[PDB]
Amino acid sequence: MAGPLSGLRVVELAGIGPGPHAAMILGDLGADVVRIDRPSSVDGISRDAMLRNRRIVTADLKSDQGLELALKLIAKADVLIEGYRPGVTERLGLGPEECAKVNDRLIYARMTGWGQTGPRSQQAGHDINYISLNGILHAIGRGDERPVPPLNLVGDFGGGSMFLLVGILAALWERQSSGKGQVVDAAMVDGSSVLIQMMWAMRATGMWTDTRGANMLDGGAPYYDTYECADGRYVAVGAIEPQFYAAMLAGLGLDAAELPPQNDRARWPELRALLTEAFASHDRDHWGAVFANSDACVTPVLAFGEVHNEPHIIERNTFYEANGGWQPMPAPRFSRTASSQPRPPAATIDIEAVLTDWD
Amino acid sequence: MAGPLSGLRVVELAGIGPGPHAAMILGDLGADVVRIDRPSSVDGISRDAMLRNRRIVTADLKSDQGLELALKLIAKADVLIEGYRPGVTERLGLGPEECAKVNDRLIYARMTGWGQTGPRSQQAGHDINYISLNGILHAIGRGDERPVPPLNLVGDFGGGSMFLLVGILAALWERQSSGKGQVVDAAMVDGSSVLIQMMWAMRATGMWTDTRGANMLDGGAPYYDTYECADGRYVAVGAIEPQFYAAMLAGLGLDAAELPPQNDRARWPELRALLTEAFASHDRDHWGAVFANSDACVTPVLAFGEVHNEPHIIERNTFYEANGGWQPMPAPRFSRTASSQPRPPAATIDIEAVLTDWD
Ligand SMILES: CCCCCCCC[C@H](C)C(=O)SCCNC(=O)CCNC(=O)[C@H](O)C(C)(C)COP(=O)(O)OP(=O)(O)OC[C@@H]1O[C@@H](n2cnc3c(N)ncnc32)[C@H](O)[C@@H]1OP(=O)(O)O
Ligand SMILES: CCCCCCCC[C@H](C)C(=O)SCCNC(=O)CCNC(=O)[C@H](O)C(C)(C)COP(=O)(O)OP(=O)(O)OC[C@@H]1O[C@@H](n2cnc3c(N)ncnc32)[C@H](O)[C@@H]1OP(=O)(O)O
């Protein structure tokens, strides 16, 4: 099995969102990932590419046989991932304390939104709820309109699965000293707050306000935003540094002497109107050409469907093809122990066959 | 130093955005992190709270002495982080190969937007550019308007710093069984693509379109969006599962029989109009109360400055007071080897002092 996490063994209690995303990535990087799902719900080989790099098994954990098979897998494994509400694995017989008795080397990884304790810890929720409570959602969107969710990128993945991964892997490094595992408490409300640490930093020093759409990186700055082109498609402009901004102006045909200063915020309305008219005068692909190989920080805003035609995406093999859709190749990349193409979802496997293989 | 990464040694070549964020999290979890900045820019004690849990040193990497000193640090370290454009560390003579001469164990971590090679590899960029090329930016915002950047959470951090971290820690695991370091190539355009794997999976199975504002999780669904309240503040609604959706309807005062189906997408506009009027009839805190302890998936949308006053936030200590204001405490959390509160940014110490300390 290719990749730097070769040999690493993982048990995943099937759930939704961050849990499986973390499990995917471990698998992506070479880990041996085994996923226990309900029989209650499996109808052949899965169509969810998020379940790649997996062996799937079925098991009613409510039954006593279920429980004990599961407990055998765990005993032979380096990591457990579960993302149910607090108390669920306890009441199944699969809690940290019950796991610590069949394998004190276990990394016990708990993926929630709200955390393991406190008033909201039993409330159902999704991405949008967790980022609503810690200031993030309020900051996203135009100023004249209600906040807009950044899909489920910030709570589920950036501030969720990825902090679960850091926790698992940080704990594996600890386990090299002490010889013992431990419990990783990954909550989306905490992870996403560390994910946005920069704004908390800038806020402290007066470089960020609570007003939506009036900051350097939220769309309020005319040099960090998208612009509609002549064809109704878009470019992105990220020309923060004055040298890059100058390069942008020259490619737009605008003379700096006729525009307000880049960072004169009181004249951002004028500046925006000027840039808006210039970008509107040609189509996205024109600007893409004009600015390729420049430091102007102007790129075309591509739709998912067009990504596979972009030279730089093609050439670094950022995507692979599989079942009527492209999918991302593993990230990041390793010089010596490279990951390989992900193995698709495979039909289910008997939990015995796995206990055998793991010997 | 408290945390699972006690006695990991990390050398950070100073940059902006992802590299410092990764370095911060490593520090947060108890790593020994030394940041080499240029003397050109160090004036006082640094007021960027992202520079917490660091020792700062200066060193002209272009002088002979600066280079030699840096290479002695790197020889005594486990991980090196650099976030310059490709070729830059090579020309300083701090490239992977020079580092492997003084330390075949080093994890060499390279943080870029576009990657190490390919047509855009030398192009300046920021977050908004990286996410423009791979379909992410196009998918965020309302459908009747131009895309809106989700701050710099998705390229710099979620698809950026966090993938650098998963790369550093997976390589440390691989090292324990091979004796050898390697090079981690973390490109924001790759990481952010994996971060958004759920949408690629969903588009593959016909459950996501390239139309902005027309999807389950992009704000197009009336049960997954924000709503403005009587006071001009907002709630977030995330009631995907029908039973959570039904609980929300009951709390709004809405008889399910008069509404269109939850998931009849052709009637979503009509459904949104009915929910809009309901939510508009009371203020945000009213709904926060009504739905406390509920599975309705309804939460108040808090601005940064309100977050310190929310019970679930206080009681889990997600933030600590510092500096000007609040900062996120480390994430995720560890049962046995727990992180401690971050140390505020050092004063510049001398690179020899560090060297004698590390001997
Ligand atoms: C249309 C559906 C698909 C929606 C797709 C959405 C994906 C993305 C979206 C934007 C997110 O943001 S995804 C993150 C949600 N939050 C969390 O994941 C954080 C923490 N977990 C939760 O809050 C809950 O899991 C959640 C609200 C997601 C679901 O609640 P639930 O349905 O009440 O499940 P809960 O976790 O409380 O417990 C269910 C358990 O099922 C039983 N048992 C598990 N595995 C097995 C098995 N193999 N065999 C038998 N039973 C199994 C447990 O016994 C338990 O049931 P019980 O409490 O009734 O005893
Ligand atoms: C917080 C404060 C303000 C932050 C403003 C924005 C914050 C967030 C924003 C939204 C982002 O998205 S941040 C991510 C940007 N992209 C990358 O980080 C991707 C990779 N790097 C780049 O593409 C470039 O670094 C970038 C475009 C960011 C800037 O280009 P550059 O200024 O030309 O720098 P480059 O990397 O090309 O090389 C600069 C180097 O400086 C010299 N030397 C470094 N350390 C030292 C030293 N200790 N002593 C002396 N000189 C030093 C290097 O020699 C090199 O210079 P050279 O090629 O002129 O020889």
DSSP state of A329: P
Query: Which among A293, A2, A54, A96 is positioned nearest to B114, based on CA atoms?
Result: A293
Residues β-bridged to residue B226 = B236
Using a 6 Å cutoff on CB, does residue B62 contact ligand 2?
Answer: yes
| Dist CA A330 CA A74 (whole Å) | 26
Chain A contact set for B318 (CB, 8 A)? 134, 189-190, 193
The first and second tokens of residue B105, run together, are 């164990």
For the CA of B244, the closest atom of ligand 1 is: 27
Whether A173 and B21 lie within 8 Å, measured CB to CB:
no
Convert chain B into a string of H (helix), E (strand) and C (coil): CCCCCCCCEEEEECCCCHHHHHHHHHHHCCCEEEEEECHHHCCCCCCCHHHCCCEEEECCCCCHHHHHHHHHHHHCCCEEEECCCCCHHHHHCCCHHHHHHCCCCCEEEEEECCCCCCCCCCCCCCHHHHHHHCCCHHHCCCCCCCCCCCCCHHHHHHHHHHHHHHHHHHHHHHHHHHCCCEEEEEEHHHHHHHHCHHHHHHHHCCCCCCCCCCCCCCCCCCCEEEEECCCCCEEEEECCCHHHHHHHHHHHCCCHHHCCCCCCHHHHHHHHHHHHHHHHCCCHHHHHHHCCCCCCCEEECCCHHHHHHCHHHHHCCCEEECCCCEEECCCCEECCCCCCCCCCCCCCCCHHHHHHHCC
Q: What is the pairing mode between strands A234-238 and A224-228?
A: antiparallel
Query: What's the B82 CA to ligand 2 centre distance in angstroms?
Result: 10
End-to-end CA distance of chain A: 17
Residue A254 and residue A278 in contact, taking contact as beta carbons nearer than 8 Å: yes
SS3 label, residue A139: helix
| Dist CA A30 CA A342 (whole Å) | 9
B344 and B305 assigned to the same domain: no
A260 and A121 assigned to the same domain: no
Selecting from B173, B240, B310 the residue whose C-beta is nearest the C-beta of A126 gives B240
Amino acid at site B127: D
Ligand number nearest CA of A217 is 2
Interface of B with A in 322-351 (CB under 8 A): 322-337
A239 and A90 assigned to the same domain: no
B150 and B263 assigned to the same domain: no
Using a 6 Å cutoff on CB, does residue B12 contact ligand 2?
Answer: no
Residue nearest to atom 12 of ligand 2 (CA): B126
Residues B19-32, buried b or exposed e (16+ Cβ, 10 A)?
A: bbbbbbbbbbbbbb
User: Within an 8 Å CB–CB cutoff, is residue A293 touching chain B?
Assistant: yes
The CATH number of whichever domain residue B278 belongs to comes to: 3.30.1540.10
Residue A191 annotated in ligand binding = no
Whether B146 and A228 lie within 8 Å, measured CB to CB:
yes
Amino acid at site B77: A
A342 and A307 assigned to the same domain: no
Does residue B316 lie within any of the structural domains? Answer: no
Q: What does the radius of gyration of chain A's CA atoms come to, in whole angstroms?
A: 24
Q: At what angle do helices A18-28 and A162-178 cross, to 10 degrees?
A: 60
DSSP state of A342: P
Does residue B319 lie within any of the structural domains? Answer: no
Residues A276-303, buried b or exposed e (16+ Cβ, 10 A)?
A: eebbeebebeebbeebbeebbbbbbbbb
| Dist CA A20 CA A82 (whole Å) | 9
User: Within an 8 Å CB–CB cutoff, is residue A46 touching chain B?
Assistant: no
Q: Is the peptide bond before B332 cis (omega within 30 degrees of 0)?
A: yes
The CATH number of whichever domain residue A67 belongs to comes to: 3.40.50.10540
Residue B151 and residue B304 in contact, taking contact as beta carbons nearer than 8 Å: no
C-beta neighbour count of A340 within 10 angstroms = 13
Count of pairs with CB atoms under 8 A, one residue in A, one in B: 509
Q: By CB neighbour count within 10 A (0-12 exposed, 13-18 middle, 19+ buried), where does A199 fall?
A: buried
Whether A24 and B322 lie within 8 Å, measured CB to CB:
no
Query: What's the A2 CA to ligand 1 centre distance in angstroms?
Result: 32
The helix or strand, by DSSP H or E, that contains position A80, with its residue range, turns out to be strand A79-82
C-beta neighbour count of A179 within 10 angstroms = 9
| Residue A231 appears among annotated catalytic residues | no
Residue B247 and residue B239 in contact, taking contact as beta carbons nearer than 8 Å: yes
User: Within an 8 Å CB–CB cutoff, is residue B41 touching chain A?
Assistant: no
| Dist CA A150 CA A138 (whole Å) | 11
Residue A127 and residue B238 in contact, taking contact as beta carbons nearer than 8 Å: yes
| Dist CA A262 CA A159 (whole Å) | 33
A65 and A188 assigned to the same domain: yes
Residues B156-194, buried b or exposed e (16+ Cβ, 10 A)?
A: bbbbbbbbbbbbbbbbbbbbeeeeebbbbbbbbbbbbbb
B189 and B232 assigned to the same domain: no
Ligand number nearest CA of A201 is 2
Residue A128 annotated in ligand binding = yes
Q: Edge-to-edge strands of the sheet including B234-238?
A: B224-228, B234-238, B298-300
| Dist CA B6 CA B10 (whole Å) | 11
Q: Edge-to-edge strands of the sheet including B182-187?
A: A333-334, B182-187, B107-112, B79-82, B9-13, B32-37, B55-58
How long is chain B? 359
| Residue A185 appears among annotated catalytic residues | no
Within chain A, how many helices (H) and strands (E) appear? 13, 12
B299 and B338 assigned to the same domain: no
Q: What's the domain range around B283?
A: 224-311
Does residue B242 lie within any of the structural domains? Answer: yes
Query: Which among A102, A98, A81, A108 is positioned nearest to A14, based on CA atoms?
Result: A81
User: Within an 8 Å CB–CB cutoff, is residue B252 touching chain A?
Assistant: no
Does residue B216 lie within any of the structural domains? Answer: no
Whether B227 and A330 lie within 8 Å, measured CB to CB:
no
Number of domains in chain A: 2
A110 and A162 assigned to the same domain: yes
A79 and A173 assigned to the same domain: yes
Q: What is the largest CA-CA distance in chain A?
A: 78
Q: What are the CA-CA distances from residue B269 to residues B150, B171, B215, B260, B272 (Å)?
A: 24, 49, 13, 10, 5
| Dist CA B334 CA B332 (whole Å) | 7
Whether B173 and A47 lie within 8 Å, measured CB to CB:
no
Q: By CB neighbour count within 10 A (0-12 exposed, 13-18 middle, 19+ buried), where does B208 fall?
A: buried
Does residue A214 lie within any of the structural domains? Answer: no
Query: Which among B153, B199, B135, B211 is positioned nearest to A299, based on CA atoms?
Result: B135
A46 and A116 assigned to the same domain: yes
Ligand number nearest CA of A243 is 2
For the CA of A224, the closest atom of ligand 2 is: 10
Method: X-ray
C-beta neighbour count of B230 within 10 angstroms = 13
The first and second tokens of residue A55, run together, are 């062996």
Q: What is the pairing mode between strands A55-58 and A32-37?
A: parallel
Does residue A27 lie within any of the structural domains? Answer: yes
C-beta neighbour count of A266 within 10 angstroms = 8
Residue that the structure tokens 């309302």 belong to? B142
Whether B47 and A205 lie within 8 Å, measured CB to CB:
yes
Q: What are the CA-CA distances from residue B135 to residues A53, B120, B155, B215 (Å)?
A: 24, 17, 12, 15
Query: What's the B84 CA to ligand 2 centre distance in angstroms?
Result: 5
Q: What is the resolution of this structure in A?
A: 2.1
Q: By CB neighbour count within 10 A (0-12 exposed, 13-18 middle, 19+ buried), where does B347 fall?
A: exposed
For the CA of B127, the closest atom of ligand 2 is: 12
Using a 6 Å cutoff on CB, does residue A22 contact ligand 1?
Answer: no
User: Within an 8 Å CB–CB cutoff, is residue B174 touching chain A?
Assistant: yes
User: Within an 8 Å CB–CB cutoff, is residue B197 touching chain A?
Assistant: yes
B185 and B68 assigned to the same domain: yes
